[PDB]
Design a protein around this ligand. Structure first.
Ligand SMILES: CCCCCCCCCCCCCCCCCC(=O)OC[C@H](CO[C@@H]1O[C@H](CO[C@H]2O[C@H](CO)[C@H](O)[C@H](O)[C@H]2O)[C@H](O)[C@H](O)[C@H]1O)OC(=O)CCCCCCCCCCCCCCCCC
Ligand code: CLA
Ligand code: CLA
Ligand code: CLA
Ligand SMILES: CCCCCCCCCCCCCCCCCC(=O)OC[C@H](CO[C@@H]1O[C@H](CO)[C@H](O)[C@H](O)[C@H]1O)OC(=O)CCCCCCCCCCCCCCCCC
Ligand SMILES: CCCCCCCCCCCCCCCCCC(=O)OC[C@H](CO[C@@H]1O[C@H](CO)[C@H](O)[C@H](O)[C@H]1O)OC(=O)CCCCCCCCCCCCCCCCC
Ligand SMILES: CCCCCCCCCCCCCCCCCC(=O)OC[C@H](CO[C@@H]1O[C@H](CO)[C@H](O)[C@H](O)[C@H]1O)OC(=O)CCCCCCCCCCCCCCCCC
Ligand SMILES: CCCCCCCCCCCCCCCCCC(=O)OC[C@H](CO[C@@H]1O[C@H](CO)[C@H](O)[C@H](O)[C@H]1O)OC(=O)CCCCCCCCCCCCCCCCC
Ligand SMILES: CCCCCCCCCCCCCCCC(=O)OC[C@H](COP(=O)(O)OC[C@@H](O)CO)OC(=O)CCCCCCCCCCCCCCC
Ligand SMILES: CC1=C(/C=C/C(C)=C/C=C/C(C)=C/C=C/C=C(C)/C=C/C=C(C)/C=C/C2=C(C)CCCC2(C)C)C(C)(C)CCC1
Ligand SMILES: CC1=C(/C=C/C(C)=C/C=C/C(C)=C/C=C/C=C(C)/C=C/C=C(C)/C=C/C2=C(C)CCCC2(C)C)C(C)(C)CCC1
Ligand code: OEX
Ligand SMILES: [Fe+2]
Lengths: 37, 341, 66, 42, 34, 28, 172, 484, 75, 38, 30, 42
């Protein structure tokens, strides 16, 4: 609700999408590059 | 089978650079510590924090460029880009000295992520994990100097800046103000660094001089196939050599190569204990029996009391320009000069 | 292998050894707690560092009641 | 003026750990003379 | 197909044009104390 | 593919060397 | 001086009068012993990592080497595949002779070069001097890290041998 | 055939002697804390708790007894200064003697638990080999620590069934053991709020009660039982050490920066109370309000307590001591006797000159007299030849106010130089350096020593996390690796 | 694909004969157009000192440090 | 009592590791004495 | 009185150097 | 005032001869465990 508290939760959301776009890209490519049995 | 197994099999795949699970912590954080240093030494100045020039835009070469520590007014703030100091602005973040904590924090999570890399590759190859335990040596020097030393001090300002000459003043700042060379933890650290360089120069020059004839060529580098089971140098000869030159010698290759691990690493752990004791200003500054005697007897001089007068010159002459935040205005008549210098 | 009277009471606490819940179990419940406890440590450090300012919370030596 | 508790620090810092390492060597040689079965085992 | 030693020659003298350019500006421009 | 592995390190490096050659010719 | 505190009287006075830290031959031997202690603990770990089972878990690791044996005491292919993945493949010495030569090259060349730093600074060919090197367009001196390093050198210079001097320049 | 660094691994496959060993470390820890506190009561002197507190006399474990509510002793003295007729059992001598009796009984129990190592409790009822059910042992031992956490915060701290925490004011004048009601809001995470300590151990005790209720019933997954190697006992040790240096950076952190759990009346002031001028600005603030209420100057400085000016002194900074100098801080310059007063320096022009104060870095510092705007007006010159700002030229007179030099004025250069040198060291005190043979160099407070040990410990235990941790994961290859 | 087989191929040098000068000149123009002084806030040689401010600028506040650098960079 | 422990082992220290550990203590005694005497 | 301890540490260190060179455990093949 | 060389007399008069008598017992039990040939001889 302050300047410092509102900016921190926005960084927490921004810290979620940085983990997110790495994770979402990693699941999709792990489907295509599976190893033959 | 599951979703976890497909991700586990993809990261551990043989490829150009081994990624693994630990590459998700290493490769983002190490890329930004290194790139934060190359940017900060090229573009970002120290004109507002220290009152210096530490960039390539400001005429500094490779030696006099640095990523510099922030102001003393910042204190020990983490200086987040979104924080109360920078408030989202990139340009004011760089001028306060925000890249320095950006380098040091993402660098500290690179050394975490690189030591986890050495546990992960050793488990896949199937070897004992002594590389990850010898690399804990350099972790104890980064943490206890770039992190634990400014935490005990007044702010991040008293930390080593990430530049070549900026380390060099930190070497000189630590003698005048702390008497760091007198500390027995540096003395056990010099014994490991000069002792570790000694062991690889001997083991380098003794293996290479007791080689067997495995070929007719004069070049001995050609005569080694990697998958051979015969040892490539005479251990019995090399023992017989040093037992008569030096008097005592290794008779154990397993003990020898372990001893080449123990000696360099222990010098980084023992020297790391002392620099934690200088965050608290628990320095080995004086021998009081030398100091009480030199006060009562104004003729008793050692080399040791000669080093204190060299430290008054470091504490007085550089501290005016060292700490512009404190505004030391020394007169000319308080600065300790010698005779006719 | 010596039965004692205190050993007889505590024996069902040690009688199980190595029974597991088959599968992934309560592992995704744990990670949501660990993600939460990671956010908790970040917040109370930034309160202490004065890099997260909360209204009517001042990090300074306060008058405890005497 | 020196600290008189430093004599106790040094001379027990020498003797107590160094007399410890002697004991681990004497019982090492006693076990080797113990198994060997000749003139010294008893 | 290009011979590999031609590649290391042209890139190798390209580095010398980069390095000696940096030792040039130690004596001219900024940071030269002129 | 490894085109993302090298060119994350080489595309910056040539860009900064484009700036370090320009700073030799900047004077006061 | 043949001592311990006399060594640091020697190193600090040598700093003020010759500026050894900016001299590139002390730079080439700090790289010699930091590199030397690196490749010592890097080679000594990869041998100790890849030791072959010859003992039990009760006795010592070192007793799996009998003296004068002819069998190789560690899987060198194992430690090559580890370091071949730890950095990349082509940066690893498969040759143990060329590996054990590089351990002898790097420190020894680093200390030959360093000991000819003291030698060329014995004849007052000092290290670099970048004091008052960065100026603005007005011409005022902008400080650098070398100017902060200079003020540490000026403190030791005006205080070493505080009675021996009579004239404004330490020619000796 | 064990090496000397593996002698204590005979206890790996023996749970019955794992306890007898862990009881013997406990009998030595408890016997230390009893015999350390008996040693401190032979050394402590409760003559003047204002100018000779317990943190000047090098008392280390004694501020940990008084933190949780022990003020009286069997001699009749108290740290609060109020006399007592009977402290009962729990005094300083009662605690010290009870940690000894606890040590003697954990000693005798470890003789039992070593001899009778073969109990049926530690056997596996399915294989017969000695096993410890480490998931349910964690459920029991975490449920107990939930009770001792919740029991501490609800009863000992809040004063329901206990004395409470030593609290104090903001400036270390008044302080007493009192119950502390918990602060549940965001103000609980203010670490200088003592209510946050009560709110913590009540809240986090409940989370530790109902995590033991979880970790008793629910068994581990098949994946986590194999991935974290929960059959091995060293994965307990690998991760217990990680939970122990992590705790040791925190306590060494909050000792060094200050918290409500580290009162400056027990451990001494922090260094950040010297760097920011935390007591210089406070002593002036109690004089700015006194002079504004129609007073003479010397009556304004006489209202200042001797304790408040005693914190405004560089010898009480923990960042002034050394490592290999030993003993209490009273070995530094002697037991303080009285406050000499507050010198005010005025030149022949009459303006007020303040002595520039020594920072914590400088062992030596040149005496410099500065007026209100930063201009150097006077000093004591090193080089006396070309002197332009000496005290003889400027004619600086010194005026004391308060203390035992209450109305005095020294005007000549020999006497003003003597008080200008001792005024850069904070306030000005009269010491007694002949009782303890005080040599004349500053020592460190117990705030400084606690931060030394428990932060050099926590750095060593980081290596134990990597050793014992990598020994757990890699367990099949520590005789060596196979060549195939 | 082996690394030495790449750089000796012509198709490699077809692509990277355009991309290297188009990226090196963009690193030139990043400096000569005066853009790098404004992103990173580095002082030009004209503007270390000003007409008013003749001393060394320092930040002297924890929280209004952004506002104080708005002061010291206008003139 | 109960039965004999099957986890009895033996401790070893060869003549080599004696001289390491002796020299380790004396050199640490040489190094740290000067600071302790102060 | 103080320097007597320093001398005993130095010549005591040179004793164990003497015994390590001449009374060393001589390594033997087979 | 006590003599400060008496701490060195007593605490080495305790420890040095008492640590001696421990060593003769440890090597006694090592020879008995050395001959016995079971689990401890090595
Ligand atoms: C091992 C392997 C490790 C792997 C590497 C991991 C790397 C992760 C990086 C760690 C991040 C740590 C930096 C956090 C910032 C910091 O520390 O920030 C410091 C802040 C403390 O803030 C400081 O607090 C001080 C205390 O002030 C207080 O006191 C003053 C006088 O009393 C005034 O009253 C003031 O108003 C009041 O706030 C001053 O205010 C300083 O200016 C202010 O910066 O604490 C905090 O955030 C947290 C401190 C409490 C936690 C303690 C652990 C961390 C510190 C360890 C060092 C302890 C010191 C020992 C030295 C050795
Ligand atoms: C919670 C603490 C803890 C516990 C219970 C253990 C337990 C163990 N460790 Mg471990 N360790 C720890 C912390 C701990 N460690 C830390 C912090 C480190 C980093 C320094 C290590 C480093 C380490 C290594 C490198 C090794 C072990 C080994 C062992 C095993 C045998 C110990 C042994 O034979 O020593 C016997 C020790 C002696 C006979 C004498 C030691 C003398 C010391 C150095 C000085 C005297 C101690 C001093 C009085 C203590 C003061 C108290 C201080 C701790 C506050 C055992 C399982 C060994 C192992 O893996 O087992 C196979 C092994 O090789 N540990
Ligand atoms: C009613 C709610 C409530 C309240 C008011 C509190 C109140 C408090 N808790 Mg608590 N807590 C609660 C519920 C609550 N708790 C619950 C439910 C849990 C879960 C069981 C916890 C778990 C918990 C933990 C684990 C910790 C607290 C702490 C604290 C204190 C925070 C202020 C402080 O000094 O931290 C200062 C803030 C920190 C120390 C941040 C920790 C981050 C670490 C230190 C980072 C560094 C780690 C690294 C290994 C160090 C080496 C790196 C080096 C280079 C720096 C305060 C007493 C902290 C405490 O006790 O400290 C005194 C603490 O560490 N709480
Ligand atoms: C019978 C119980 C008992 C009681 C009431 C006391 C009472 C006391 N002891 Mg003592 N002690 C005891 C047993 C006891 N002792 C035993 C058995 C030992 C041997 C181990 C000791 C060893 C000992 C020492 C060495 C010292 C004391 C000291 C003290 C005094 C201050 C305590 C203090 O500050 O600790 C503070 C306690 C802590 C900070 C513990 C924190 C616990 C950590 C943070 C737990 C975190 C992990 C947790 C389990 C995770 C799960 C949390 C979950 C709830 C979510 C106090 C008079 C001190 C003193 O002055 O001695 C005279 C002192 O230095 N004690
Ligand atoms: C087996 C070995 C047994 C010997 C142990 C050897 C240890 C030697 C080192 C400790 C002794 C040195 C103390 C100086 C001697 C002296 O006279 O002091 C003497 C001082 C006592 O000081 C005396 O006190 C008296 C009243 O108390 C009078 O005031 C005397 O004037 C004053 O000198 O003793 C100590 O300071 C002992 C301190 C020992 C505890 C160490 C605390 C610090 C530990 C931090 C741990 C960090 C470790 C991290 C890992 C590294
Ligand atoms: C394909 C992938 C390639 C991967 C690239 C990986 C990135 C890592 C590269 C690290 C380079 C870091 C060195 C920075 C040097 C710099 O740019 O100086 C560039 C500076 C700029 O030059 C300065 O320019 C200023 C402009 O105002 C002034 O004119 C100064 O006078 C002038 O010296 O040049 C120097 O200082 C001259 C000497 C250069 C010496 C550099 C070598 C020193 C030894 C370091 C070796 C690093 C090894 C890297 C191995 C890779
Ligand atoms: C349920 C879990 C409850 C938490 C675990 C029990 C509390 C243990 C915490 C440590 C004990 C508290 C410190 C000692 C208190 C002390 O000094 O006492 C002393 C106090 C009274 O002490 C009086 O104090 C006076 C003022 O200080 C004077 O000092 C008097 O001399 C002194 O007699 O007595 C109590 O507090 C005793 C209560 C402590 C708890 C008793 C043991 C509880 C055991 C129950 C668990 C077993 C049942 C489980 C089911 C099976
Ligand atoms: C293994 C054990 C190692 C320890 C040996 C233990 C022996 C302890 C007894 C001797 C030490 C007690 C001396 C007092 C300590 C003290 O401080 O003294 C200290 C004095 C020295 O005295 C100091 O001297 C200094 C300058 O010399 C200053 O003057 C000091 O002020 C003064 O105190 O030392 C002695 O007197 C040591 C004497 C030892 C030799 C004994 C001579 C008598 C022997 C007669 C033999 C008869 C035996 C017949 C059989 C019975
Ligand atoms: C004129 C020249 C004649 C030669 C001069 C002789 C001086 C030689 C010094 C002897 C070293 C003795 C240390 C015993 C050490 C010991 O006996 O080790 C014996 C050890 C033999 O190991 P093995 O292979 O026998 O061990 C196999 C296993 O049993 C391991 O336990 O040899 C070495 O490893 C020593 C190599 C390092 C040598 C360390 C020397 C360090 C220098 C000395 C530091 C002290 C100087 C202090 C002065 C104040
Ligand atoms: C900061 C930051 C960032 C960024 C990052 C990155 C992305 C970076 C990168 C960067 C990089 C990564 C850089 C690089 C650089 C490089 C360089 C610039 C190099 C140079 C080189 C040189 C100069 C060298 C030389 C040489 C040669 C060439 C050859 C011979 C040898 C020698 C060595 C001499 C971000 C965005 C996150 C944001 C935040 C902050
Ligand atoms: C039997 C019995 C008893 C008795 C008991 C007792 C009397 C106890 C005591 C005990 C004791 C009295 C103990 C003590 C202990 C101590 C300790 C255990 C200590 C140690 C320490 C340490 C070892 C440390 C170390 C160090 C140093 C020295 C320096 C610095 C570093 C360090 C810290 C590491 C009774 C009658 C009650 C009851 C019945 C039975
Ligand atoms: O003698 Mn020894 O140090 Ca070569 O510089 Mn000149 O001389 Mn003396 O002064 Mn500085
Ligand atoms: Fe080797």
């Amino acid at each position: 609700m302050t300047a410092s508290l509102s900016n921190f939760i926005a960084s927490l959301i921004a810290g979620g999408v940085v983990v997110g776009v790495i994770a979402i890209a990693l699941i999709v490519i792990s489907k295509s590059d599976r190893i033959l049995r | 089978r599951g979703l976890f197994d497909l991700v586990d099999d993809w990261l551990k795949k043989d490829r150009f650079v081994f990624v693994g699970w630990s590459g998700l912590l290493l490769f983002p954080t190490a890329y930004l510590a290194a790139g934060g240093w190359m940017t900060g030494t090229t573009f970002v100045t120290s004109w507002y924090t220290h009152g210096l020039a530490s960039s390539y835009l400001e005429g500094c070469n490779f030696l006099t460029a640095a990523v510099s520590t922030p102001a003393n007014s910042v204190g020990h703030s983490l200086l987040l880009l979104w924080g109360p100091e920078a408030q989202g602005d990139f340009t004011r973040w760089c001028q306060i000295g925000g890249l320095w904590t950006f380098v040091a924090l993402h660098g500290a999570f690179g050394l975490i992520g690189f030591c986890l890399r050495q546990f992960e590759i050793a488990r896949l190859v199937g070897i004992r994990p002594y590389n990850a335990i010898a690399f804990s040596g350099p972790i104890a020097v980064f943490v206890s100097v770039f992190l634990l030393y400014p935490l005990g001090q007044a702010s991040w300002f008293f930390a080593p800046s990430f530049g070549v000459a900026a380390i060099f003043r930190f070497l000189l700042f630590l003698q005048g103000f702390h008497n760091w060379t007198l500390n027995p933890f540096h003395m056990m650290g010099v014994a490991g660094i000069l002792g570790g360089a000694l062991l690889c120069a001997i083991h380098g020059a003794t293996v290479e001089n007791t080689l067997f004839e495995d070929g007719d060529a004069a070049n001995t580098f050609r005569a080694f196939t990697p998958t051979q089971s015969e040892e490539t140098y005479s251990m019995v000869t090399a023992n017989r050599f040093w037992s008569q030159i030096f008097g005592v010698a290794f008779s154990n290759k397993r003990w020898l190569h372990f001893f080449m691990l123990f000696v360099p690493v222990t010098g980084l752990w023992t020297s790391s204990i002392g620099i934690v004791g200088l965050a608290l200003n628990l320095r080995a500054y004086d021998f009081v029996s030398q100091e009480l005697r030199a006060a009562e007897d104004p003729e008793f001089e050692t080399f040791y009391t000669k080093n204190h007068l060299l430290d008054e010159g470091i504490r007085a002459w550089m501290a005016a320009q060292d700490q512009p935040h404190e505004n030391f205005v020394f007169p000319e008549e308080v600065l300790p000069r010698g005779n006719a210098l | 292998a010596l039965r004692t009277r205190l050993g007889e009471i505590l024996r069902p606490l040690n009688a199980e050894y190595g029974k597991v819940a088959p599968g992934w179990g309560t592992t995704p419940i744990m990670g949501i707690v660990m993600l939460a406890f990671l956010i908790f440590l970040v917040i109370i450090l930034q309160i202490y560092n004065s890099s997260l300012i909360i209204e009517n919370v001042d990090v300074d030596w306060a008058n405890g009641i005497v | 003026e020196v600290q008189f508790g430093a004599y106790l620090a040094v001379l027990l810092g020498t003797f107590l750990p160094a007399l410890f390492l002697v004991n681990l060597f004497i019982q090492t040689e006693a076990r080797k003379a113990g198994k060997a079965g000749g003139q010294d085992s008893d | 197909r290009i011979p590999l030693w031609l590649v290391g020659l042209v890139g190798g003298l390209a580095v010398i044009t980069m390095l000696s350019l940096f030792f040039y500006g130690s004596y001219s421009g900024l940071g030269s104390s002129l | 593919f490894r085109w993302l592995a090298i060119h994350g390190l080489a595309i910056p490096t040539v860009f900064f060397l484009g700036g370090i050659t320009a700073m030799q010719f900047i004077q006061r | 001086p043949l001592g311990i505190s006399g060594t640091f009287n020697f190193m600090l006075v040598f700093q003020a009068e010759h500026n050894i830290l900016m001299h590139p031959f002390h730079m080439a031997g700090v790289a010699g012993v930091f590199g030397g202690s690196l490749f010592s603990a890097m080679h000594g770990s990869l041998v100790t990592s890849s030791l072959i089972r010859e003992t039990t878990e009760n006795e010592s690791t070192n007793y799996g080497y009998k003296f004068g044996q002819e069998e190789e005491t560690y899987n060198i292919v194992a430690a090559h595949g580890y370091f071949g993945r730890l950095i990349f493949q082509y940066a690893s010495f498969n040759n143990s002779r060329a590996l054990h030569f590089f351990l002898a090259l790097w420190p020894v060349v680093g200390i030959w070069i360093t000991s000819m730093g003291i030698s060329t600074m014995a004849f007052n060919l000092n290290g670099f001097n970048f004091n008052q090197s960065v100026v603005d367009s007005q011409g005022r001196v902008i400080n650098t890290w070398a100017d902060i390093l200079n003020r540490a050198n000026l403190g030791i210079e005006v205080m070493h041998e505080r009675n021996a001097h009579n004239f404004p320049l330490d020619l000796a | 055939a064990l090496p000397w660094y593996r002698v204590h691994t005979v206890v790996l496959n023996d749970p019955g002697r794992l306890i007898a060993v862990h009881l013997m470390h406990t009998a030595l820890v408890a016997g230390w804390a009893g015999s350390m506190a008996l040693y401190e009561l032979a050394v402590f002197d409760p003559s003047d708790p204002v100018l000779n507190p317990m943190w000047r006399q090098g008392m280390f474990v004694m501020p940990f007894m008084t933190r949780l509510g022990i003020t009286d002793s069997w001699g009749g003295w108290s740290i609060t200064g109020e006399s007592v007729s009977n402290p009962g059992i729990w005094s300083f001598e009662g605690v010290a003697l009870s940690h000894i009796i606890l040590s003697g009984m954990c000693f005798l129990a470890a003789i039992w638990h070593w001899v009778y190592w073969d109990l049926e409790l530690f056997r596996d009822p399915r294989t017969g080999e000695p096993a410890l059910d480490l998931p349910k042992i964690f459920g029991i031992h975490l449920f107990l620590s939930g009770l001792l956490c919740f029991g501490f915060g609800a009863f000992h701290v809040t004063g329901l069934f206990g004395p409470g925490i030593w609290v104090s004011d903001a400036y270390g004048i008044t302080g007493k053991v009192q119950p502390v009601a918990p602060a549940w809001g965001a103000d609980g995470f203010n670490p200088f709020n003592p209510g946050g300590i009560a709110a913590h151990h009540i809240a986090a005790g409940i989370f530790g009660i109902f995590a033991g209720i979880f970790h008793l019933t629910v068994r581990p997954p098949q994946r986590l039982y194999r991935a974290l190697r929960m059959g091995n006992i060293e994965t307990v040790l690998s991760s217990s050490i990680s939970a122990v240096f992590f705790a040791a950076f925190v306590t060494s952190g909050t000792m060094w920066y200050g918290a409500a759990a580290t009162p400056i009346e027990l451990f001494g002031p922090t260094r950040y109370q010297w760097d920011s001028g935390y007591f210089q600005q406070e002593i002036e603030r109690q004089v700015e309000t006194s002079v504004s209420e129609g007073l003479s100057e010397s009556q304004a400085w006489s209202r200042i307590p001797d304790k408040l000016a005693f914190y405004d002194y560089i010898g009480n900074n923990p960042a002034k001591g050394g490592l290999f100098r030993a003993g209490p801080m009273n070995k530094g310059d002697g037991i303080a006797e009285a406050w000499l007063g507050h010198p005010i320096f005025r030149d022949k022009e009459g303006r007020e000159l303040t002595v520039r104060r020594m920072p914590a870095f400088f062992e030596t510092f040149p005496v410099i007299l500065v007026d209100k705007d930063g201009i150097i007006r006077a000093d004591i010159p090193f080089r006396r030849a070309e002197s332009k700002y000496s005290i003889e030229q400027v004619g600086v007179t010194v005026d004391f106010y308060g203390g035992k030099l209450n109305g005095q004025t020294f005007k000549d250069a020999p006497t003003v130089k003597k008080f200008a040198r001792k005024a850069q060291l904070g306030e000005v005190f009269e010491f007694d350096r002949t009782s303890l043979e005080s040599d004349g160099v500053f020592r460190s407070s117990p705030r400084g020593w606690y931060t030394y040990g428990h932060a050099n410990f926590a750095l060593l235990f980081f290596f134990g996390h990597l050793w014992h941790g990598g020994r757990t994961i890699f367990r099949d290859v520590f005789t060596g690796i196979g060549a195939e | 694909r082996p690394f030495s087989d790449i750089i000796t191929s012509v198709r490699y040098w077809i692509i990277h004969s355009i991309t290297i000068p188009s990226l090196f000149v963009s690193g030139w123009l990043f400096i000569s157009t005066g853009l790098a002084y404004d992103v990173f806030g580095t002082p030009r040689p004209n503007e270390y000192f000003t007409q008013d401010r003749q001393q060394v600028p320092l930040v002297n506040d924890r929280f209004s440090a952004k506002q104080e650098l708005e002061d010291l960079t206008k003139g | 009592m109960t039965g004999p422990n099957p986890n009895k082992q033996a401790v070893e220290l060869n003549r080599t590791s004696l001289y390491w550990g002796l020299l380790l203590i004396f050199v640490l005694a040489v190094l740290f004495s000067s600071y302790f005497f102060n | 009185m103080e320097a007597l301890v320093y001398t005993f540490l130095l010549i005591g260190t040179l004793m164990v150097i003497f015994f390590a060179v001449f009374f060393r455990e001589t390594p033997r093949i087979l």
